[PDB]
């Protein structure tokens, strides 16, 4: 009675036309709205009342609604159209607002970028303070999946490793960071430690020594 279904993901070549559906019982007689949400920003209304665009939304965004399916259609897709898209209705027979589960839109064809790795050793100040942190900074990579592995003298370390999940940068590539923690004796006891970053089958390593 009150469920809106969307394909969970849609992917499309640049310059092509994308289509995202919103299924619902008699949705064609209801009034459907669409929202675009890019990572870390607030949702933006891109289409309302089935097919009107708010001012500032280009015509590539159009909408439709008939029978049990509403459709958001994005013409001439750009990489900047990558986002989550939600459809929405007011259900008159309950006075609830209902969102669809959301569609991931992927624009295929962006090129691969290997990450840049920067690695800092503990400073003398941390050491005098019982901290010692190894800091691995990973930036400018695409796509956004990566594995980070720490080594101490060619031996794997898993204890004391804290790693972020990747996030989009402003340049639309990704970043992530890994911190290793160790005692000053642990730091002073090895020849080296290593931050080893693998991305799309390739591994980039940086190493630091006391």
């Amino acid at each position: 009675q009150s469920v809106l279904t969307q394909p969970p993901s849609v992917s499309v070549a640049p310059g092509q036309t994308a289509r995202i559906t919103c299924g619902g019982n008699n949705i064609g007689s209801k009034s459907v709205h669409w929202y675009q949400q890019k990572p870390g920003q607030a949702p933006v209304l891109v289409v309302y009342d089935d097919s009107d665009r708010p001012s500032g939304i280009p015509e590539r965004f159009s909408g439709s609604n008939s029978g049990n399916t509403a459709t958001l259609t994005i013409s001439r897709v750009e990489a900047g159209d990558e986002a989550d898209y939600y459809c929405q209705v007011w259900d008159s027979s309950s006075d609830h607002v209902v969102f669809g589960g959301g569609t991931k839109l992927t624009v295929l064809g962006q090129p691969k970028a290997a990450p840049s790795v920067t690695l800092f050793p503990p400073s003398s100040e941390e050491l005098q303070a019982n901290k010692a942190t190894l800091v691995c900074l990973i930036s400018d990579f695409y796509p956004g999946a990566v594995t980070v592995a720490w080594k101490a003298d060619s031996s794997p370390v898993k204890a004391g490793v804290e790693t972020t999940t990747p996030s989009k940068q402003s340049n639309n590539k990704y970043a992530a960071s890994s911190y290793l923690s160790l005692t000053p004796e642990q730091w002073k006891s090895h020849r080296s430690y290593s931050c080893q970053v693998t991305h799309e089958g390739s591994t980039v390593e940086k190493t630091v020594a006391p």
Partner: protein, 215 residues
């Protein structure tokens, strides 16, 4: 311009309550229904409920009815949402949105309020300079073991903005956060130019400046 400005990020212990605010400007605050929608990390938009700013009447999605309370102050064009008996799962970003006088969607959204539910205590950061190891160099700052989010990092009191990359913080196992800021600078500048990362952690009333010098 029409605008919705929400209160700052809050942190609360499980079982406690939080009250979030939504300040509207640039239109007649009492003409449109106000909605609240939640987005837990990595989740979709979830409609919570609406309030009539003019009359005060409320209507709630089944999931949110009862432990969510919507109110408003006409005075400062501010809407309020309260969550009671908080649970760890309630950690999310909360949005208020304008919609409905006759509903044309939610055309205006606040910037979102982060509510974190946790038992950790407010803790100011220890700040450490990351000295640099050619054409360019990467010098940085380590903001370690703090709670809660967020912290602010600027370089040279704002004079340095180009080449500044401040990474999203990591939530360690300890319960505490850590984040690094790195700035790319020319290698000829070291020994000649002063580099200072300004760190501010409002929740613990901590302001710290650190000179980052070559090794």
């Amino acid at each position: 311009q029409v605008q919705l400005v929400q209160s700052g990020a809050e942190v609360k212990k499980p079982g406690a309550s939080v009250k979030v605010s939504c300040k509207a400007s640039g239109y007649t605050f009492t003409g449109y229904y106000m909605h609240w929608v939640r987005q837990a990390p990595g989740q979709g938009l979830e409609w919570m409920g609406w309030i009539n700013p003019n009359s005060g009447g409320t209507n709630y999605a089944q999931k949110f009815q009862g432990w969510v309370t919507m109110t408003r102050d006409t005075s400062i064009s501010t809407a309020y949402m309260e969550l009671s008996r908080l649970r760890s799962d309630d950690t999310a970003v909360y949005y208020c949105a304008r919609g409905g006088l006759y509903y044309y969607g939610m055309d205006v959204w606040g910037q979102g309020t982060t509510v974190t539910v946790s038992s950790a205590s407010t803790k100011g950061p220890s700040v450490f300079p990351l000295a640099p190891s050619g054409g360019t160099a990467a010098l940085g700052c380590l903001v370690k073991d703090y709670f809660p989010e967020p912290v602010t990092v600027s370089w040279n009191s704002g004079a340095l903005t180009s080449g500044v990359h401040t990474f999203p913080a990591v939530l360690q196992s300890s319960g505490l956060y850590s984040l690094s800021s790195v700035v790319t600078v020319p290698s000829s500048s070291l020994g000649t130019q002063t580099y200072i990362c300004n760190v501010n952690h409002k929740p613990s009333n901590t302001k710290v400046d650190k000179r980052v010098e070559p090794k």
